Structure formats: structure tokens, C-alpha cells
């Protein structure tokens, strides 16, 4: 239980102690196995040279099986089996960590809201790595374990399914991420503005409304015509954050399974803008 002056300026200064418990130890074991697999595959990909590892770490990854393997339960190791093992161990560690958060909420007498907000992110992660590859029958549709590689996977996923900008659930997830940033800036600024009135002590304001909660409500009522309460704004933020990953999982489930081209889907439904033909005589040379 050490102290931290620099962290004590933005917030509290105490770091620890941390309670791991049984599920915490299990999650750490699973996750360390996953991290060891990923990192050792990265280090072997530069022929064990740590100079080249330092040079190329953003470009390095553990790569999923190729499409030639399909949904083979355990492909050959150096052909995606390492990726499948790392994904299994990471998923087990993440699920055990979710159970750990649920249990920590229960043992403190607190509600399990953080656990069910983590469940949305776990749902998105599972759709990204396991659930969608199972339905499409190919491990190759899953992100690599790498810094620049999962950005490449992101771009190539958008390109493969025709401009994921035209995925309505991608639009909704972007709206919810922008709204998460919007709502959290709103709430941070509002609570900081009424911090002179005791507004940072929100739970005390929930069971006993003070002038801080009243003025925080009235600022937004006079600004945009409606407001929340000291507790309801946290439900607003919680739901906005949950919807990000919920719509993300929903829009990734629908890509390739029910919709294969999103721009053409928007064209069918009157969503894609039509632009004046600046290039009048361009056709497909292979037609």
C-alpha cells in the first residue's frame, strides 16, 4: 500500500492493496500463458533478436490461421495453432476476470453494474474473435495479436465488406462512442463546476439532494430543456458505454453472415449518397 504524489494530484495517492482471490489467480495464470505465447511468437518472428524486436514491435503479431484451415479446432502450431491457443487462454482469463469483478461487487455489498458493463465489452471481444469465425467457419476472420496488424485487420475488414461506414450498426456504435465522450465530458465538467458546492460526493447527493445537484440539473435544463438527476446521469453514461460494444458486436455479427456488401446494402435501402458522374465513360474492363 504505497503512496503516489503525482497520482495524488489528479486523484487519490494510495495504490493498493489489490484483492485477487481464486478467480483472480486463475485469470492471471490463463492470461500469462496467453501473453507468453503471443510475445514468444513475436520474438521468434524476428529470429529472437531483441534489437529487431525493439525495431519492429508495432509490426509484429501472432497471426490467425489461414483460410485453408477453416474452423479446424486446433490447426498446426506455426500455422495458426499458437493464435488459437492464445485466444483460448485470453478468453478464459477475461471470463475469469469478469467473474472476479462480479464477485468483488458482491462481496462489497455493491451492485454488479461494472460487471455487466464489462460483459458488453466481452461480448464484442467474443464476436470479434470466436463467435463470428464459428458462424463463418474460418479462424482467418479474427484479428491478429499485434499493434499494426490489428489496424490492418480493421482496414481490411472494412474494405472486404464494402465500406463499413455503411453498416448501420457501425454508425450506431460510432454515435454511441461519440456520445460516451460527449456525456463524460459533460458530466466531468458539470461535477467540477459544482465541486464548489460538494458535487463530487455524488452518492451523498443521490440520497440527500443538495444545491450542487439542483444547480447541476438546472444548468442543463436551462441549456437544453431537459436534465437528469445525480444518479440518472450515471445510468445514461453506463448505457451509452454499453451500447458502444453492443452495437459493435451486432454489426460485426451481421458482416458476412447476412450482409456481404454494406455499401450495396445502403444503396438498396436508400442510404448511400449518389454523386454526379464526373467520370462519364469509365466501365469495368473485365466485363
Amino acid at each position: 500500500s504505497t503512496l503516489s504524489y503525482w497520482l495524488g494530484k489528479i486523484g487519490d495517492a494510495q495504490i493498493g492493496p489489490i484483492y485477487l482471490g481464486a478467480t483472480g489467480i486463475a485469470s492471471l495464470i490463463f492470461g500469462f500463458v496467453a501473453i507468453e505465447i503471443i510475445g514468444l511468437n513475436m520474438l521468434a518472428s524476428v529470429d529472437w533478436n531483441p534489437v529487431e524486436f525493439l525495431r519492429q514491435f508495432p509490426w509484429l503479431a501472432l497471426e490467425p490461421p489461414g483460410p485453408e484451415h477453416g474452423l479446424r479446432a486446433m490447426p498446426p502450431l506455426n500455422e495458426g495453432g499458437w493464435w488459437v491457443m492464445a485466444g483460448f487462454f485470453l478468453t478464459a482469463s477475461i471470463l475469469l476476470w469478469w467473474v472476479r469483478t462480479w464477485q468483488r461487487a458482491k462481496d462489497l455489498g455493491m451492485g454488479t453494474h461494472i460487471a455487466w458493463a464489462f460483459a458488453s465489452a466481452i461480448f464484442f471481444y467474443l464476436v470479434l474473435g470466436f463467435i463470428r469465425p464459428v458462424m463463418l467457419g474460418s479462424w482467418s476472420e479474427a484479428p491478429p495479436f499485434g499493434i499494426f496488424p490489428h489496424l490492418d485487420w480493421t482496414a481490411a475488414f472494412s474494405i472486404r465488406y464494402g465500406n463499413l461506414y455503411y453498416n448501420p450498426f457501425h454508425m450506431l456504435s460510432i454515435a454511441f462512442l461519440y456520445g460516451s465522450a460527449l456525456i463524460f465530458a459533460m458530466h466531468g465538467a458539470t461535477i467540477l463546476s459544482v465541486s464548489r458546492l460538494g458535487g463530487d460526493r455524488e452518492v451523498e447527493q443521490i440520497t440527500d439532494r443538495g444545491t450542487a445537484a439542483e444547480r447541476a440539473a438546472l444548468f442543463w435544463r436551462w441549456t437544453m430543456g431537459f436534465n437528469a438527476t445525480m444518479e440518472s446521469i450515471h445510468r445514461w453514461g453506463w448505457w451509452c458505454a454499453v451500447f458502444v460494444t453492443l452495437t459493435a458486436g451486432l454489426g460485426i455479427l451481421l458482416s458476412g453472415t447476412v450482409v456481404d456488401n454494406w455499401y450495396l446494402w445502403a444503396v438498396k435501402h436508400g442510404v448511400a449518397p449518389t454523386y454526379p458522374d464526373v467520370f462519364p465513360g469509365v466501365t469495368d474492363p473485365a466485363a
Binding site: A13, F169, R196, D208, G210, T211, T229, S232, V258
Partner: protein, 245 residues
């Protein structure tokens, strides 16, 4: 085709509309939770309570407070204290004019809520905000300047007194108020104070020398209630509009 119901409809469109229904239901639920304080509404001209449907006002939920008691929201309690402010003609939206001293009366930015008349407690049941002179287990970090002994300057560039003690939140280890002995003792909320360690001064630009002499004081010199806290903080907040002007 794979994900089609017709030549126009398809699975993604239906899942999108299902999420539209779910999102609109969630927004309705959230707006119901927004109405747990301040509703039902009242008119700006006679204070008549406006009728809100039972589908917009949720049933009261009970909060079992940590130190005992049950708070319900909504609670059918309405702030009906007499506001010492007037306006010419009861026109909807017409702002009010304080009759006397808005800071002492608590009008506008000086208005405060009738909170609990008991001091805030901790988990173990001991007073949360106490002066540092009473608790020996709490000290000030040596890396930060000590506010005690610093001169207190109001918004009129007048030294109104000196800092005699600091009131610390025992649940968060943070200085909540500054006990200032006026050159007779007042509490200055720390967010309303600016510190200068080179000149050893504390500037409270929201107060004048006249306003410091009328700051509400706690009944006890080592104990402050939530209502006294709320009143003092509201006084200093209303000083931003009513003091230097």
C-alpha cells in the same frame, strides 16, 4: 441469397429496427429515471403542480442510507421556502429581484437546499469532515504548502484575515474547507480559494470584506452538518454574482 426476407427486406434491417425499439425503450426508461427529482413540475405563475402521467413518473424507489434512514425518490416533498425576491408582474420566465441581501437570504446563486441537519459520517460512524486540529492520524503532505497561517485576501484586494486551520474529509483525505479567522471565524470552501505559496496568501475573489462578515457559521467549531455545509458553499457560490458588484 442468404440474409433476405424479400427483394427489399433483409435480416440486418430487421435487427436494426429491433435495436431501434430497444434503444427507444432504454431512452424512455432513462427519461423516467431523470424525473425522480423535481417532478411533478409546477407553473411559474402560481406554483400549481402540473399533472404528469404515471408512465412518465416512476414509482418511488427507497434508498437505505448507510447511517440509517430511508430516502424515497420521488418523495412528494417540494421546496416551498419563501424566496426573498420579487418581480413586476407574474409573467412566465420573468426573473426575480432580491428584496434585501441575496447572500444572507439565499436567493439565486446563494440559494441552498434543506439537506440533513446531521453531520456527514464515515463507514465506522465518525464525522467525515473535521478540522485538522482534532485528528492526529491526519496530517498534510510535506510536498504541498501548508495553508495554515496564510493571509486571506478577498476579491477587493483586502486582507480579511488568516487561515487558522483546515477541515479535512476523513473519507477521502482531502481538504474541504479552510477555517479563516477574520481580523470571527469562517469556513472557506477550498475550490473557491486560490493559493500563492510565494507570497503566502489565499485569494477568495468571490467575497468582499462585507460578505465575509456575514458568512454563515456552523453551530459547532469542530462539527458541521450537511445543511450548514450546503449553506456555506451556496453563500460563497452566490458571492460570485452578488459580492463584487
Amino acid at each position: 441469397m442468404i440474409g433476405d426476407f424479400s427483394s427489399y427486406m433483409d435480416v440486418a434491417q430487421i435487427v436494426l429496427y429491433a435495436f431501434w425499439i430497444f434503444l427507444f425503450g432504454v431512452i424512455f426508461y432513462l427519461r423516467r429515471e431523470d424525473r425522480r427529482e423535481g417532478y411533478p413540475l409546477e407553473r411559474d405563475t402560481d406554483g400549481k403542480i402540473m399533472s404528469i402521467g404515471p408512465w412518465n413518473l416512476p414509482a418511488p424507489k427507497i434508498f437505505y442510507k448507510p447511517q440509517g434512514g430511508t430516502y424515497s425518490a420521488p418523495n412528494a416533498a417540494r421546496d416551498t421556502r419563501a424566496i426573498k425576491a420579487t418581480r413586476v408582474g407574474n409573467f412566465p420566465g420573468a426573473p426575480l429581484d432580491p428584496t434585501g441581501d441575496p447572500l444572507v437570504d439565499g436567493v439565486g446563486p446563494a440559494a441552498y437546499a434543506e439537506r440533513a441537519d446531521t453531520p456527514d459520517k464515515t463507514l465506522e460512524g465518525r464525522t467525515r469532515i473535521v478540522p485538522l486540529r482534532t485528528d492526529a492520524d491526519l496530517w498534510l503532505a510535506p510536498e504541498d504548502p501548508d495553508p495554515r497561517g496564510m493571509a486571506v485576501v478577498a476579491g477587493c484586494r483586502t486582507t480579511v484575515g488568516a487561515v487558522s486551520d483546515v477541515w479535512v474529509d476523513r473519507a477521502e483525505n482531502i481538504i474541504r474547507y479552510l477555517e479563516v479567522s477574520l481580523g470571527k471565524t469562517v469556513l472557506v470552501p477550498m475550490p473557491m480559494a486560490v493559493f500563492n505559496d510565494l507570497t503566502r496568501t489565499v485569494t477568495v475573489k468571490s467575497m468582499d470584506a462585507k460578505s465575509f462578515a456575514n458568512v454563515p457559521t456552523p453551530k459547532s467549531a469542530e462539527q458541521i452538518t450537511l445543511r450548514e455545509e450546503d449553506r456555506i458553499q451556496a453563500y460563497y457560490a452566490g458571492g460570485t454574482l452578488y459580492a463584487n458588484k
